[PDB]
Design an enzyme around this catalytic site. Sequence first.
Site, short mmCIF file in Angstrom:
data_model
loop_
_atom_site.label_atom_id
_atom_site.label_comp_id
_atom_site.label_asym_id
_atom_site.label_seq_id
_atom_site.Cartn_x
_atom_site.Cartn_y
_atom_site.Cartn_z
N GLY A 186 16.65 4.50 5.38
CA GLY A 186 16.66 5.79 6.06
C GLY A 186 15.65 6.78 5.50
N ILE B 27 12.64 4.69 -0.23
CA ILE B 27 11.57 3.71 -0.01
C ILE B 27 10.92 4.01 1.33
CG2 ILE B 27 11.06 1.24 0.32
CD1 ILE B 27 11.77 2.20 -2.65
N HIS C 236 7.04 -1.37 2.39
CA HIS C 236 6.90 -2.43 1.41
C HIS C 236 5.96 -3.48 1.99
CE1 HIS C 236 11.06 -4.00 2.97
NE2 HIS C 236 10.13 -4.57 3.71
N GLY D 19 2.91 -17.04 6.37
CA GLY D 19 4.11 -16.48 6.98
C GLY D 19 4.27 -15.02 6.64
N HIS E 196 5.52 -3.59 6.04
CA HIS E 196 6.54 -2.97 6.87
C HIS E 196 6.70 -1.52 6.44
CE1 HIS E 196 7.52 -7.11 7.75
NE2 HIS E 196 8.61 -7.18 7.03
N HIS F 7 -1.91 2.00 0.19
CA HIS F 7 -1.19 1.50 -0.97
C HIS F 7 -0.57 0.14 -0.65
CE1 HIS F 7 1.63 1.84 -4.46
NE2 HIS F 7 2.45 1.15 -3.67
N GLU F 8 0.12 0.05 0.50
CA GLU F 8 0.75 -1.21 0.87
C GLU F 8 -0.24 -2.34 0.99
OE1 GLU F 8 3.85 -1.68 0.61
OE2 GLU F 8 4.29 0.46 0.37
N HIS G 221 -0.87 -4.15 -2.16
CA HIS G 221 0.09 -5.23 -2.36
C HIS G 221 -0.21 -6.46 -1.50
CE1 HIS G 221 2.66 -2.76 -4.88
NE2 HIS G 221 3.06 -1.94 -3.92
N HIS H 131 1.47 -2.71 -9.15
CA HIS H 131 1.45 -1.31 -9.50
C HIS H 131 0.62 -1.10 -10.75
CE1 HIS H 131 5.17 -0.38 -6.93
NE2 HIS H 131 4.07 -0.12 -6.25
O1 LIG Z 1 5.70 0.47 -3.84
C1 LIG Z 1 6.07 0.21 -2.67
O2 LIG Z 1 5.29 -0.40 -1.89
C2 LIG Z 1 7.46 0.52 -2.29
C3 LIG Z 1 8.35 -0.62 -2.80
C4 LIG Z 1 8.51 -0.63 -4.31
C5 LIG Z 1 8.68 -1.85 -4.97
C6 LIG Z 1 8.80 -1.84 -6.36
C7 LIG Z 1 8.76 -0.65 -7.06
C8 LIG Z 1 8.55 0.57 -6.42
C9 LIG Z 1 8.41 0.56 -5.03
C10 LIG Z 1 8.18 1.86 -4.32
N1 LIG Z 1 8.05 1.78 -2.90
S1 LIG Z 1 7.73 3.16 -2.08
O3 LIG Z 1 7.92 2.88 -0.68
O4 LIG Z 1 8.53 4.16 -2.67
C11 LIG Z 1 6.05 3.65 -2.29
C12 LIG Z 1 5.13 3.50 -1.28
C13 LIG Z 1 3.83 3.99 -1.38
C14 LIG Z 1 3.49 4.72 -2.51
C15 LIG Z 1 2.17 5.30 -2.65
C16 LIG Z 1 1.55 5.58 -3.87
C17 LIG Z 1 0.34 6.26 -3.95
C18 LIG Z 1 -0.27 6.70 -2.78
C19 LIG Z 1 0.36 6.45 -1.55
C20 LIG Z 1 1.57 5.77 -1.47
C21 LIG Z 1 4.42 4.83 -3.55
C22 LIG Z 1 5.70 4.30 -3.45
CA LIG Z 2 13.14 5.34 3.56
CA LIG Z 3 1.49 -12.94 6.96
ZN LIG Z 4 10.52 -5.62 5.36
ZN LIG Z 5 3.85 -0.12 -4.25
#
Ligand SMILES: O=C(O)[C@H]1Cc2ccccc2CN1S(=O)(=O)c1ccc(-c2ccccc2)cc1
Ligand SMILES: [Ca+2]
Ligand SMILES: [Ca+2]
Ligand SMILES: [Zn+2]
Ligand SMILES: [Zn+2]
Length: 163
Positions: A76, A80, A83, A90, A96, A118-119, A122, A128
């Site tokens: 919600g 978060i 991710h 796959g 997402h 950021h995503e 990953h 991180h």
């Molecule tokens: O890290 C993630 O992808 C997800 C999943 C996860 C997995 C393990 C540990 C922490 C987190 C935090 N989250 S999150 O949604 O809270 C998040 C998303 C983007 C940014 C960000 C940083 C800098 C600039 C712009 C965006 C920070 C945090």
């Molecule tokens: Ca959320």
């Molecule tokens: Ca894929």
């Molecule tokens: Zn997902």
């Molecule tokens: Zn992250």
Amino acid sequence: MLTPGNPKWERTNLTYRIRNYTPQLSEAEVERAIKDAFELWSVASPLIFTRISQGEADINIAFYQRDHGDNSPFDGPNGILAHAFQPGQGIGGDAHFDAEETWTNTSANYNLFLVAAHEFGHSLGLAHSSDPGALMYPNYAFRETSNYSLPQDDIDGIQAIYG
Ligand SMILES: O=C(O)[C@H]1Cc2ccccc2CN1S(=O)(=O)c1ccc(-c2ccccc2)cc1
Ligand SMILES: [Ca+2]
Ligand SMILES: [Ca+2]
Ligand SMILES: [Zn+2]
Ligand SMILES: [Zn+2]
């Protein structure tokens, strides 16, 4: 800065697909946020990203609420935001976004371009960073987006994986 086990894409021309949209931005605005998020990484590496409109892509992008099929439910508003999965087949690479957030192209929480950028770190194999100036730092913060380019720590990280 690299994910454990060093998972990386074996090819450098990857495709992506935006599967659905968020109503709070136009479709064009979402497409632009995503395009520009990929380009940040492309200009610091050999990676080339090709959008496809339908069919199977390397990196699927979608907005989902709560439970959405991958055993990592969203939560919600706030908390978060999004991710992504490490490189692989796959679900690997896929990103997402929590459909219940406020998504913006402004300084207001949450700027989609920055979160997507950021995503995709990953999705490409970065972990991180402890560097509070890095895009891969674990906590969201706005930065000016009009002429944004990868922070140096993130350049170092993508270079370490892909040259
Ligand atoms: O890290 C993630 O992808 C997800 C999943 C996860 C997995 C393990 C540990 C922490 C987190 C935090 N989250 S999150 O949604 O809270 C998040 C998303 C983007 C940014 C960000 C940083 C800098 C600039 C712009 C965006 C920070 C945090
Ligand atoms: Ca959320
Ligand atoms: Ca894929
Ligand atoms: Zn997902
Ligand atoms: Zn992250």
